[PDB]
Amino acid sequence: MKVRPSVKPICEKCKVIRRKGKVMVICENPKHKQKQG
Amino acid sequence: SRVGKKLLEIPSDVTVTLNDNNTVAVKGPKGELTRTFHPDMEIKVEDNVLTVARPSDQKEHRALHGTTRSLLGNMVEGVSKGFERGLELVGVGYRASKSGNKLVLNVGYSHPVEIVPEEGIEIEVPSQTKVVVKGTDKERVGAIAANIRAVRSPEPYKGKGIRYEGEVVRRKEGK
Amino acid sequence: NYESPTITIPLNPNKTPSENAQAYFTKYQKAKNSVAVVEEQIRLAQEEIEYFDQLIQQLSSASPRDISEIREELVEGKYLRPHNPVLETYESTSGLTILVGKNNRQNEYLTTRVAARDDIWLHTKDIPGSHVVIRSSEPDEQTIMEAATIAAYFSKAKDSSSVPVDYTKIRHVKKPKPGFVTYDSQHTVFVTPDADTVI
Amino acid sequence: MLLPKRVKYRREHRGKMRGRAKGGTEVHFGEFGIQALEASWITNRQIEAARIAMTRYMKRGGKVWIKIFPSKPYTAKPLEVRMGSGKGAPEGWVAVVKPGKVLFEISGVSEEVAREALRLASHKLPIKTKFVKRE
Amino acid sequence: VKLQIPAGKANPAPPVGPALGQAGVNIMGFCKEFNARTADQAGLIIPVEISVYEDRSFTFITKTPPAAVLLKKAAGIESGSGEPNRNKVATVKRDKVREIAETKMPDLNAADVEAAMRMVEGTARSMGIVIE
Amino acid sequence: IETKKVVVEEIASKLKESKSTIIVDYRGLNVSEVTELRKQLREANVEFKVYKNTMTRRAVEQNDFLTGPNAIAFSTPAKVLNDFAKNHEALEIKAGVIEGKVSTVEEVKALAE
RNA sequence: UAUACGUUAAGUGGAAAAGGAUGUGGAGUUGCUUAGACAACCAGGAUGUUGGCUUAGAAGCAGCCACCAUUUAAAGAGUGC
């Protein structure tokens, strides 16, 4: 997990989604895993 | 290119009862199982098949039309599947048994742990690692599967802990 | 050993047969790389040793203009720090003129700049000396003997007769690296000498 | 650090930013430009930061045709000082903008490389802009 | 398992002693079976595929040598081109292509002679050789 | 889609010119078993290829068999196919034709036996 | 608690940026595309060749050149594990 405002994926298996009105990056990788808040 | 566009069936031993506008019940060999719903979706049981229409070509009515298969809602994504989840642990002394229907648990702690299959589940412990939840509700079966695996979930630094038996676990290279 | 000694090795418990096998290969290639590095270093070192000996080969025949010329050669070698001054020649005893390659660079100027290909060339056969050439003069018995003679008594082995200078067409005279030239495809002529004929 | 080596007056009145770019609003010395949507006062350190960014993403990247030059100076008085006592002292340089103005053309390198290079260039910057190319 | 061994050699443990030591065969036993069947040149190279049934009932098919080997013997190279399409360190003939066809058209893997040659020349350019 | 028209055109050319052909489902067998089959049919000189079902059906009308992934073997054979089939048994022998003699499964079997 | 036509859902409205974003609705452009596309699922994903070099071994996957040709529906001298 990584907070930032400048969220965006890294790999291609990094995947863009939304959750609870908030933007997130799924990936396989926790060290790609992200979201804003 | 769609989930909901299908015409979704009434195979056998099935009995709907539209108890009101949106209150509906089902019987089948899987069991008798009932719900109540939103009014916009015009849901209509035909000979051997159910059909639904949405009043408005809208984002949520799409969700519903995609949950148009079997029992009542997402359980109108469930009946004719009919459900279970196995689980095999990954351990050394990690194991379990049952207290009747209930479940006895001997894993990683100064104490053991106890669990109950309240909702007509059958737990089956064919082996000390092999256990199976079985029922007819995706919600409930997956729910307890996760409840369990959260307790002693599996590990990165070793393959330990509970496992969704079909999982592709992250093998962090056990350091 | 497919040989059959049955060595009982060290194998490092808590570390796999794989791990320790490829670690054996790791130390193998490691000692291999270390020693091969050190052996090409030492190969550079041996060619450097005979490069001193070659510098000295020319130096024992060097004159003071060659002292300055080799100071330039060692700016080139990086070893020193101080304009067309190619080389010189001498009067052969056979009433000819022999170009006297008097240094590394003077040899470049007397042979690689001045002399002609397929000419008669000569260098001191393992004696500390300079080279010479009967450039565009196919050194006959007399001329080749006199040139090999001037070399045979101009070397630091001037006491040793039978200086066996390999002569032939300069077409085969090799050149390289840098300062790595040779005179090959060549028949040896053993010579002795007097001195004052050169002038 | 872009400079004018020589100047008439070390100092100026400050200036304003109204309206739009007179000229140089389109790539024609190069191929693939970037242009303004705003305007501000800009430093040679910033533009050369973009330079090194794009030319490392590209590693020699093509050719540019920079459109600008930091003609304007600006002053900066010393610190914890009161008003007056004459205008402050010249500090650095300034490069001014109008919206619609092109800043950097590019040529000799692929359009996609151009896009990403100027992405990394743009994210340096205080402004809003967009990619452009020749007619 | 594919092996790649000269027709006359036997008991190179390190190649197959692993490869069929988990299978557990006589190293020299099977390698001299191989030499008895391919009683031919040592220093040569035969590709040979061994098929083992679950009960350890091993059989195998020996096959024609590599064109790499034949043309190392032809041109006289040890390594192929250090950089094919930049260095060509070896040269053969169209006649050599036909010789190798007639040698190995049993093992060749395109029904036509010309498509056989297309594949053969795919390999010739793989290893970086020119034609005479 | 003029390129689609060229594709359908060329396939139509061969598909009209087809005078004897046996038609089969292909599924569940690797490229190497496939290439074994190809070796034996190549030496059989019975010309095997692979084509698509929309287009095959448009020819037949020019159908219930015709769905599913279908390959063909021209003549102008099915014994080799019996061999491969009983040897391997991941196929179907749905239909065939000889000089326009559109063939049942049992009829292609008779032609194949 | 006006009328008509659309908007948003954040209480934005009713406090602000860089920047982010399959948010949204609107127009508009443009290739695939019901000879059925895309996805899912099923079938395959092969041959010389483990391409050659180097490497103890480099075998699609240490690194270097090559990156060919064939069954071909198509499978790379290999996209990643």
From Swiss-Prot, chain A:
Pfam families: Ribosomal_L36. Disulfide bonds: none annotated. One of its GO terms (molecular function) is structural constituent of ribosome. Keywords: Ribonucleoprotein, Ribosomal protein. GO terms for cellular component: cytoplasm; ribonucleoprotein complex; ribosome. The keyword Transport does not apply. The keyword Glycoprotein does not apply. InterPro entries: Ribosomal_bL36, Ribosomal_bL36_sp. GO terms for biological process: translation. It comes from the Bacteria. PROSITE patterns: RIBOSOMAL_L36. Belongs to the bacterial ribosomal protein bL36 family. Part of the 50S ribosomal subunit. HAMAP family: Ribosomal_bL36. This is Large ribosomal subunit protein bL36. It comes from Bacillus subtilis (strain 168). The lineage of its organism: Bacteria, Bacillati, Bacillota, Bacilli, Bacillales. The gene is rpmJ.
UniProtKB/Swiss-Prot annotation, chain B:
Part of the 50S ribosomal subunit. It comes from the Bacteria. Belongs to the universal ribosomal protein uL6 family. The keyword Nuclease does not apply. One of its GO terms (cellular component) is cytosolic large ribosomal subunit. PANTHER family: 60S/50S RIBOSOMAL PROTEIN L6/L9, LARGE RIBOSOMAL SUBUNIT PROTEIN UL6M. The keyword Ribonucleoprotein applies. It comes from Bacillus subtilis (strain 168). This is Large ribosomal subunit protein uL6. GO terms for molecular function: rRNA binding; structural constituent of ribosome. GO terms for biological process: cytoplasmic translation. Keywords: Ribonucleoprotein, Ribosomal protein, RNA-binding, rRNA-binding.
From Swiss-Prot, chain D:
The keyword rRNA-binding applies. One of its GO terms (molecular function) is rRNA binding. GO terms for biological process: translation. It comes from the Bacteria. HAMAP family: Ribosomal_uL16. PANTHER family: 50S/60S RIBOSOMAL PROTEIN L16, LARGE RIBOSOMAL SUBUNIT PROTEIN UL16M. This is Large ribosomal subunit protein uL16. It comes from Bacillus subtilis (strain 168). The lineage of its organism: Bacteria, Bacillati, Bacillota, Bacilli, Bacillales. The gene is rplP.
UniProtKB/Swiss-Prot annotation, chain E:
Disruption phenotype: Depletion gives a strong growth defect, a ssrA deletion and rplK depletion is synthetically lethal. RqcH is no longer recruited to 50S ribosomes, no change in RqcP recruitment. One of its GO terms (biological process) is response to antibiotic. GO terms for molecular function: large ribosomal subunit rRNA binding; structural constituent of ribosome. PROSITE patterns: RIBOSOMAL_L11. InterPro entries: Ribosomal_uL11, Ribosomal_uL11_bac-typ, Ribosomal_uL11_C, Ribosomal_uL11_C_sf, Ribosomal_uL11_CS, Ribosomal_uL11_N, Ribosomal_uL11_N_sf. SMART domains: RL11. One or more lysine residues are methylated. An unidentified mutation in this gene gives rise to thiostrepton resistance. PANTHER family: 60S RIBOSOMAL PROTEIN L12, LARGE RIBOSOMAL SUBUNIT PROTEIN UL11M. Forms part of the ribosomal stalk which helps the ribosome interact with GTP-bound translation factors. Required to recruit RqcH, which is part of the ribosome quality control system (RQC), to stalled 50S ribosomal subunits. NCBIfam families: L11_bact. This is Large ribosomal subunit protein uL11. The gene is rplK.
